[PDB]
């Protein structure tokens with residue numbers, strides 16, 4: 001899997017809800033963009049990463065840019081994939097995420 | 105409303121979200137391959153070229169540009185494009201530009 005192949009974009013409202021997701025998210029994590037709309041990213045985070053991700057978000061919201069560092073994202077058919085995400089606030093109107101899958 | 109696109113540093117569309125139909129009237133394949141500057145108003149072409157040139161020097165920070173974009177239905181629409189470079193720090197591939205493109209009021 002090439003680097004471009006492990007990267008997908010997502011867009012979020014200020015409350016973390018998906019408003020847009022690349023179709024690439026499908027072959028990586030199972031979900032279809034269509035079924036992610038309106039659901040908060042927070043629902044998909046491993047419990048052990050929840051607080052870190054809340055803080056990453058808080059740093060994004062005040063500074064405009066953030067690197068999540070590593071976190072586990074719940075796959076559609078069970079299991080957690082590791083990800084890293086660069087987030088950017090577009091002014092606030094939305095959050096743009098460039099998400100890279102650290103797993104296999 | 106708005107649509108995301110990705111470009112190479114020369115301005116060429118390399119990815120376009122389907123939200124573009126409702127925003128500017130084209131299908132993704134009518135944009136893919138072409139340089140964004142080909143859809144831009146001749147008075148705004150240079151500002152736009154210079155903006156692509158600068159976004160790659162701003163250390164992955166957000167650069168915003170406002171320009172007129174020729175919709176499929178023929179008309180000049182005012183667009184606000186906020187853009188930023190991304191480069192996967194695991195690799196040394198050339199960065200590319202991620203854009204969000206919104207129809208805004210000039211007023």
Ligand SMILES: O[C@H]1c2c(C(F)(F)F)ncc(OC3CC(F)(F)C3)c2C[C@H]1F
Pocket residue numbers: 010012013014015016017041044053056057060066067068073083085086087088095097099
């Ligand atoms: O809080 C923002 C965020 C971040 C952050 F690091 F930038 F803060 N990282 C991952 C995020 O969502 C995941 C990307 C995904 F995989 F699509 C779900 C999100 C949703 C945004 F609202």
